Design a protein around this ligand. Structure first.
Ligand code: FRW
Ligand code: CA
Length: 240
């Protein structure tokens, strides 16, 4: 997250860190959202790779014991069948992970609330991105979970020539674009939390940024629109 602020420990309890094994240690690579005690939602492009993964829930600081972490292996990965490897702009950038064991819920570990199917946010809706991703273009990962206010940019504006043009599909959400705040590498797969009728719900899965950098004016961060995939989510969970 570029332009972020440090999140409180208990603000975004559905956020997870998705890590891969690198020799003897584990490294953060993506975010995700806990959606059942044994299922995580993330981006397809995080998990279509030759790596071994684990999930950490209750995480705050990647490099220090928080006293709240639960570490769980990943037992099954289901990528959207229409995802095409390394083609983010085609969409379908979503995957579900069944965890090897159910996690326990507490003030640091809660399920993300999903929107109702088909829900679309008004332009300029209030949302926050969260993650441990780079804090500057070509920078380094955050140690502590960051948040940034990233209001939505609706489809009619986002798909206009001055923004993302025909790159953006209606199955995506755009947020931000002020040139100061954005997602960045390592935020992929995590939530976009938007305040609707008094409740934060996870409306986006962080997907991609511009070829010109993370924080680029009129190039909002682009997210998979969760509300376009609710039937798919429920079908996968029911079948596995
Ligand atoms: C995420 O944390 C990370 N996402 C990315 O880095 C994604 C994954 C593939 C590459 N990517 C990008 O965001 C890159 N953008 C594109 O590849 C791209 C831009 C525009 C178009 C088009 O058609 O208009 C097509 C592709 C940029 C150049 C890095 C973050 C940024 C959310 C993780 F992948 F884990 F690093
Ligand atoms: Ca920690």
């Amino acid at each position: 997250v570029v332009g972020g602020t440090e999140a409180q420990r208990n603000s975004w309890p559905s956020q997870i860190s998705l890590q891969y094994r690198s020799g003897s240690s584990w490294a953060h690579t993506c975010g995700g959202t806990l959606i059942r005690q044994n299922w995580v939602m993330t981006a397809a492009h995080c998990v279509d790779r030759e790596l071994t993964f684990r999930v950490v829930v209750g995480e705050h600081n990647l490099n220090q014991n928080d006293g709240t972490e639960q570490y769980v292996g990943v037992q099954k990965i289901v990528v959207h069948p229409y995802w095409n490897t390394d083609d983010v702009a085609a969409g379908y950038d979503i995957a579900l992970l069944r965890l090897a064991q159910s996690v326990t819920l507490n003030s640091y570990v809660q399920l993300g609330v999903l929107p109702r199917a088909g829900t679309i946010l008004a332009n300029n809706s209030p949302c926050y991105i969260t993650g441990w991703g780079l804090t500057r273009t070509n920078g380094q990962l955050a140690q502590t979970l960051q948040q940034a206010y990233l209001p939505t940019v609706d489809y009619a504006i986002c798909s206009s020539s001055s923004y993302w043009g025909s790159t953006v599909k209606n199955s995506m959400v755009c947020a931000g674009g002020d040139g100061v705040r954005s997602g960045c590498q390592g935020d992929s797969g995590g939530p976009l939390h938007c305040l609707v009728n008094g409740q934060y719900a996870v409306h986006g899965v962080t997907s991609f940024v511009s070829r010109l950098g993370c924080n680029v004016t009129r190039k909002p961060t682009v997210f998979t629109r969760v509300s376009a995939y609710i039937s798919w989510i429920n079908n996968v969970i029911a079948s596995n």
